[PDB]
Amino acid sequence: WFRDNGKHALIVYDDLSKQAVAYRQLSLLLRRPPGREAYPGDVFYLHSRLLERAAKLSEKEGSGSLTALPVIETQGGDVSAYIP
Amino acid sequence: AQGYAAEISARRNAMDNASKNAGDMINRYSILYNRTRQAVITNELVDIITGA
Amino acid sequence: STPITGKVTAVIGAIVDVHFEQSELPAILNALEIKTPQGKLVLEVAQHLGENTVRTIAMDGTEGLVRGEKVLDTGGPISVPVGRETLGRIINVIGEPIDERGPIKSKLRKPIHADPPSFAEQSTSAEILETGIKVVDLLAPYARGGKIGLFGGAGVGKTVFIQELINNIAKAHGGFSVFTGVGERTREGNDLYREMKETGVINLEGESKVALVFGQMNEPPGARARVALTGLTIAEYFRDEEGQDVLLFIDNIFRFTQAGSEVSALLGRIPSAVGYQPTLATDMGLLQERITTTKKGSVTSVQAVYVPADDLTDPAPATTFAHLDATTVLSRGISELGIYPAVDPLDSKSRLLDAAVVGQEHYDVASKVQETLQTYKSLQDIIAILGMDELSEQDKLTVERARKIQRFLSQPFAVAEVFTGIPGKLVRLKDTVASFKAVLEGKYDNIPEHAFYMVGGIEDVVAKAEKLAAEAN
Amino acid sequence: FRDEEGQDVLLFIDNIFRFTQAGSEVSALLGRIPSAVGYQPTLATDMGLLQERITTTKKGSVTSVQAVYVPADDLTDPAPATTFAHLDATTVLSRGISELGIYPAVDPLDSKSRLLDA
């Protein structure tokens, strides 16, 4: 809303890891086929759709920008997992 | 006396080298430990979503 | 033809189930268009569940979809507009131009899932395309119809190298280009499009050199999986229509393979535990089979795989050199020295750099250049440590020749005339070999080192030498 | 041979772990829910009857000599771990000694037998 109104806004997507696990729970409870690490294959779809909202528009749209700062609460420093 | 001083200085250097070896071995093996213990979580995830 | 139509029965997130009638069921990899208020949505079939129902994957978001919605069958795979009208235009996975430049006025629409050629038609002949930049066409010459790639970081000039490659192929080979946007960040995609426009190589009112097919990865995984397919279709149509050795630009194999793995996961497939990806075998193999050499033209895909912090996780990005025929690494060290082409000559190897493939003199020149560069760095270690004095006269000759070769690697780019204002040049493969060998024997040692800097071709070397001797000296 | 003939039987069962492997084999397609690490749920019971059918009776004796192939040299795997408890004499052939040069590889610690008495 701020981004399209010419204003600058900052979104900080705190602890998106539990967002991923919540969507995994919803999918596994919704007969969706499990994927990597039991996460559904569309968590990447969800995260792409969510993080592409935050962007810098051109001056045509009022030069409004949305800034994304998510965090991933990995365990043991292993960001090699599928969701990180 | 100087030989004793040099011997214990080299002892300090060698034990510092052993301490560095222990530190980097512990770092890499703690990364391995975290990887293995997370692999236990992956295994329990897979057998719960397959069995149940 | 009968009006084939279906009814939506299930929407499994991105997956959509549509119920058809008897004999009205389309095959798999078949587009199924649904009229939606936010534009046009089509779905390709991947699984036939049964009872006149086919499981499909959407190319875009399924927002507002309702059971019983009419689904129209195109008749075959996802047809995308093809031809010269697609050059310089942003076209999505479905085929609708998303550049906000109007509809694409293409007279043909070749299906994305075209029949791959046969083994007997797999031409094993290995011949080297002339690019237009000496370092790439000599140190790691590009295989024709093979799988070459770019492995560079950020800020080293990978995008401008892509621009120079496509411009040179358009001017030297006379062939257009295609760049795919599988797994793209829309920010870097917009930056790349802006750079593409500002380089003046896609004249919006004039001629365009690259058919920049582009698919956002905020879309469902099927769109990412098939954007590479539609880019392949555009390249294949260009090859089979015009006698052009067009080059294809995959922005990342890893993104395509991860998209394929999640497509399989949604469809009902699964990888192995603790992390391993063998599922890509069908799609990766089909994609490779779509990039071969035909009798009339060829397609040379570029695997511009960005370095993942020196750690390739998935098997396909892991050890890419197996799939690579000519490695083109863009290291920051060479760009630190000021050499505009970030191609590291030592680490840029090619599997086609052989005596019986590129030529006797080509192989000799390339091997001598590589050995001179290796000796150059080896003696540069002792030059930096013990000083220049601790070095022999033969070592001096080798060091100066290899330094002249290295400074000669810096050549102008025809796309950099606005980025840094340099008179971009298109060198010739024969001219490249002649200049490199002439530098090799040492007959140009009297030429100043600054003359070897920022030039293309030995004629420009002597021109800069005489200019330096006429203005400064 | 032990009962009717009344003779000391030197039973040499080779790769007894293959019995449990085939049990897991048939179990996957029998509709059984897989046990830990994918083994058959009835591994313990069926191997129990199989191994307890080997014993020293009054009629005679069966000196079963079994070799167990431990998967990935992981002694915590359920089949070799339970075979450890379902067996008198244990001779572990660790790979860490096999590649060390002592190819007999009998690890001198986990290789235990009930005969170790004064």
Swiss-Prot record, chain A:
This is ATP synthase subunit alpha, mitochondrial. Present with 41500 molecules/cell in log phase SD medium. Belongs to the ATPase alpha/beta chains family. F-type ATPases have 2 components, CF(1) - the catalytic core - and CF(0) - the membrane proton channel. CF(1) has five subunits: alpha(3), beta(3), gamma(1), delta(1), epsilon(1). CF(0) has three main subunits: a, b and c. The chain holds residues 293 to 376 of 545 of the full protein. Mitochondrial membrane ATP synthase (F(1)F(0) ATP synthase or Complex V) produces ATP from ADP in the presence of a proton gradient across the membrane which is generated by electron transport complexes of the respiratory chain. F-type ATPases consist of two structural domains, F(1) - containing the extramembraneous catalytic core, and F(0) - containing the membrane proton channel, linked together by a central stalk and a peripheral stalk. During catalysis, ATP synthesis in the catalytic domain of F(1) is coupled via a rotary mechanism of the central stalk subunits to proton translocation. The gene is ATP1. Coiled coil: none annotated. It is found in: Mitochondrion inner membrane.
Curated annotation (Swiss-Prot), chain B:
Signal peptide: none annotated. Transmembrane segments: none annotated. It is found in: Mitochondrion; Mitochondrion inner membrane. It comes from the Eukaryota. Belongs to the ATPase gamma chain family. F-type ATPases have 2 components, CF(1) - the catalytic core - and CF(0) - the membrane proton channel. CF(1) has five subunits: alpha(3), beta(3), gamma(1), delta(1), epsilon(1). CF(0) has three main subunits: a, b and c. Present with 28100 molecules/cell in log phase SD medium. Mitochondrial membrane ATP synthase (F(1)F(0) ATP synthase or Complex V) produces ATP from ADP in the presence of a proton gradient across the membrane which is generated by electron transport complexes of the respiratory chain. F-type ATPases consist of two structural domains, F(1) - containing the extramembraneous catalytic core, and F(0) - containing the membrane proton channel, linked together by a central stalk and a peripheral stalk. During catalysis, ATP synthesis in the catalytic domain of F(1) is coupled via a rotary mechanism of the central stalk subunits to proton translocation. This is ATP synthase subunit gamma, mitochondrial. It comes from Saccharomyces cerevisiae (strain ATCC 204508 / S288c) (Baker's yeast).
Swiss-Prot record, chain C:
It is found in: Mitochondrion; Mitochondrion inner membrane. The modification Phosphoserine is found at S335. InterPro entries: AAA+_ATPase (IPR003593), ATP-synt_VA_C (IPR055190), ATP_synth_F1_bsu (IPR005722), ATPase_a/bsu_AS (IPR020003), ATPase_alpha/beta_chains (IPR050053), ATPase_F1/V1/A1_a/bsu_N (IPR004100), ATPase_F1/V1/A1_a/bsu_N_sf (IPR036121), ATPase_F1/V1/A1_a/bsu_nucl-bd (IPR000194). CDD domains: ATP-synt_F1_beta_C, ATP-synt_F1_beta_N, F1-ATPase_beta_CD. The modification Phosphothreonine is found at T74, T199. SUPFAM superfamilies: C-terminal domain of alpha and beta subunits of F1 ATP synthase, N-terminal domain of alpha and beta subunits of F1 ATP synthase, P-loop containing nucleoside triphosphate hydrolases. ATP binds at G152, G153, A154, G155, V156, G157, K158, T159. SMART domains: AAA (SM00382). Coiled coil: none annotated. The keyword Cytoplasm does not apply. Keywords: ATP synthesis, ATP-binding, CF(1), Hydrogen ion transport, Ion transport, Membrane, Mitochondrion, Mitochondrion inner membrane, Nucleotide-binding, Phosphoprotein, Transit peptide, Translocase, Transport. It catalyses: ATP + H2O + 4 H(+)(in) = ADP + phosphate + 5 H(+)(out). PROSITE patterns: ATPASE_ALPHA_BETA (PS00152). GO terms for biological process: proton motive force-driven ATP synthesis; proton motive force-driven mitochondrial ATP synthesis. Pfam families: ATP-synt_ab (PF00006), ATP-synt_ab_N (PF02874), ATP-synt_VA_C (PF22919). GO terms for cellular component: cytosol; mitochondrial inner membrane; mitochondrial intermembrane space; mitochondrion; proton-transporting ATP synthase complex. GO terms for molecular function: ATP binding; ATP hydrolysis activity; proton-transporting ATP synthase activity, rotational mechanism; proton-transporting ATPase activity, rotational mechanism. The keyword S-adenosyl-L-methionine does not apply. Its EC number is 7.1.2.2. Present with 164000 molecules/cell in log phase SD medium. Belongs to the ATPase alpha/beta chains family. This is ATP synthase subunit beta, mitochondrial. It comes from Saccharomyces cerevisiae (strain ATCC 204508 / S288c). The gene is ATP2.
